[PDB]
Amino acid sequence: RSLSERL
Amino acid sequence: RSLSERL
Amino acid sequence: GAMGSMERASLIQKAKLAEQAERYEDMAAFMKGAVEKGEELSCEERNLLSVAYKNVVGGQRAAWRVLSSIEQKSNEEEKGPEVREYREKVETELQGVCDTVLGLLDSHLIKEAGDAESRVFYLKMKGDYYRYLAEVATDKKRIIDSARSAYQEAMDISKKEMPPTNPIRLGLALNFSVFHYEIANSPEEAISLAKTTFDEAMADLHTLSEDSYKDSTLIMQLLRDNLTLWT
Amino acid sequence: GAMGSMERASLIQKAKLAEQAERYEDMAAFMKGAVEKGEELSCEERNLLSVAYKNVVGGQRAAWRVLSSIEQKSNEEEKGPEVREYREKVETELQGVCDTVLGLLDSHLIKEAGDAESRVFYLKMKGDYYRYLAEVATDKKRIIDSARSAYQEAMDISKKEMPPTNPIRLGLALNFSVFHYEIANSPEEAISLAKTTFDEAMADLHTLSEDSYKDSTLIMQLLRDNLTLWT
Ligand SMILES: N=C(N)c1cc(-c2ccccc2)c(CCN)s1
Ligand SMILES: N=C(N)c1cc(-c2ccccc2)c(CCN)s1
Ligand SMILES: [Cl-]
Ligand SMILES: [Cl-]
Numbered sequence: 104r105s106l107s108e109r110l
Numbered sequence: 111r112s113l114s115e116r117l
Numbered sequence: 118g119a120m121g122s123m124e125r126a127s128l129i130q131k132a133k134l135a136e137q138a139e140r141y142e143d144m145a146a147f148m149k150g151a152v153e154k155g156e157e158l159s160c161e162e163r164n165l166l167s168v169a170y171k172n173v174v175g176g177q178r179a180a181w182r183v184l185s186s187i188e189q190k191s192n193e194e195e196k197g198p199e200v201r202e203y204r205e206k207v208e209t210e211l212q213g214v215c216d217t218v219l220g221l222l223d224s225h226l227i228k229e230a231g232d233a234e235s236r237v238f239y240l241k242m243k244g245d246y247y248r249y250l251a252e253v254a255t256d257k258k259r260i261i262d263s264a265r266s267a268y269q270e271a272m273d274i275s276k277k278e279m280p281p282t283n284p285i286r287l288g289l290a291l292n293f294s295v296f297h298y299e300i301a302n303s304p305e306e307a308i309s310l311a312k313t314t315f316d317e318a319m320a321d322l323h324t325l326s327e328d329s330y331k332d333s334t335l336i337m338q339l340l341r342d343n344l345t346l347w348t
Numbered sequence: 349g350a351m352g353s354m355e356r357a358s359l360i361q362k363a364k365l366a367e368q369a370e371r372y373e374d375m376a377a378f379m380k381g382a383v384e385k386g387e388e389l390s391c392e393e394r395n396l397l398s399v400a401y402k403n404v405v406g407g408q409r410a411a412w413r414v415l416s417s418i419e420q421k422s423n424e425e426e427k428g429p430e431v432r433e434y435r436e437k438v439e440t441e442l443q444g445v446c447d448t449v450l451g452l453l454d455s456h457l458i459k460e461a462g463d464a465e466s467r468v469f470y471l472k473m474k475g476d477y478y479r480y481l482a483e484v485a486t487d488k489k490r491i492i493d494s495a496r497s498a499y500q501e502a503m504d505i506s507k508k509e510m511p512p513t514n515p516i517r518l519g520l521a522l523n524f525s526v527f528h529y530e531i532a533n534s535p536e537e538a539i540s541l542a543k544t545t546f547d548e549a550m551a552d553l554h555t556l557s558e559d560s561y562k563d564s565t566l567i568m569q570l571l572r573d574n575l576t577l578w579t
Pocket of ligand 1: 164
């Protein structure tokens with residue numbers, strides 16, 4: 104799965 | 111902390 | 118709401134405590150209560166709201182994926198309706214969280230957000246939560262277009278009003294690229310967006326302090342990691 | 349209960365799915381529903397019940413410890429009642445989970461459990477959940493004595509009816525040793541129990557298959573790890 108924005 | 115039983 | 122009797126400042130204080138205790142459902146409930154006080158949110162408060170709901174929905178998405186995989190394997194020995202029922206249960210709970218977040222954005226966070234940093238943040242969130250709805254949708258075209266529309270409005274503002282290294286702008290472009298690859302069946306658009314975003318940020322790093330450089334390059338690395346997976 | 353309309357077998361199936369999805373609150377609700385059908389539980393079902401509640405209460409205990417630490421530091425700048433209130437909120441939820449488990453054991457799992465493997469398992473669980481109540485109690489003497497009494501009854505049965513390598517017997521002795529060290533202010537009793545348990549198990553390993561040897565030595569290592577921390 105593609106990486107989305109982290110916190 | 112002391113180690114208790116695992117699952 | 119059950120938080121209506123608690124002071125705004127106390128809700129924010131408790132959201133921070135809940136984060137430290139890894140109690141993200143509590144954290145989200147406290148931040149929902151804070152939003153419902155009707156005042157705009159500061160930068161720190163917007164981040165608390167996002168952290169809380171991202172963790173809640175993230176657990177739901179991970180569980181839904183496990184259950185959906187089991188269900189798909191069962192449909193290749195007949196075991197009855199239970200896998201479908203339980204996947205549906207988790208799915209419905211996930212949809213409920215997304216609808217709650219979208220409801221807060223619509224009533225009335227977005228309409229009161231005039232500065233680029235807040236407006237882009239909320240429109241990105243709107244894109245993100247429609248994207249999570251799209252992941253489980255099978256309706257689906259309209260949900261995808263709602264995500265696309267929110268991300269596109271956020272992108273237009275961000276490109277006009279923020280430098281290419283701004284962490285909100287970078288995280289928006291990152292998530293819109295994920296939308297293109299994983300939701301919209303547009304891997305070329307995803308790759309193009311990630312590359313252009315990375316390159317324009319690289320060229321602006323020289324303007325940044327050490328701390329801002331660290332913030333921006335951390336997010337750029339996620340763009341690079343996706344480009345390595347996608348190419 | 350909300351699970352009253354679901355088949356026992358479906359509840360067990362869904363508890364297993366919930367475990368795979370790391371949805372332990374759901375898992376516990378499914379297993380509570382299964383217990384409330386009124387039939388005794390098999391070995392596998394008892395383990396599902398224990399896994400579910402151990403994970404739920406484990407998250408609560410970890411959160412309570414974070415909050416209690418923050419609270420104790422505040423009582424060494426005045427920040428108002430919020431830390432205490434939120435620690436109390438988590439504490440009350442934790443106590444509610446413990447009371448739920450103790451209620452299932454009392455109505456009517458223990459009284460119907462005649463075989464050593466089931467009776468020891470449930471009495472150990474009773475000791476464990478009173479121990480978790482004791483961790484937050486400040487009442488406290490009676491709670492401690494209830495934990496001690498349950499563990500002691502379980503120990504007496506286990507020593508008469510099970511070999512020293514039996515994993516239930518080992519996990520009971522392990523947890524009773526933790527009770528002595530962490531709850532009852534009896535570190536010498538804890539060390540003595542862990543040592544005797546370890547040594548008697550060591551001497552019985554020769555009777556075991558490869559798989560049982562693996563099961564027993566895994567738990568023995570926890571006794572050894574505690575002895576290293578305690579001495
Ligand atoms: N408590 C959290 N998870 C976060 C708090 C903040 C923050 C923002 C402005 C001023 C002070 C703190 C975050 C910024 C984004 N890294 S994140
Ligand atoms: N699903 C779980 N977490 C566990 C399931 C079982 C089991 C017991 C008897 C027969 C088949 C399975 C466990 C035994 C203890 N290791 S644990
Ligand atoms: Cl279900
Ligand atoms: Cl509270």
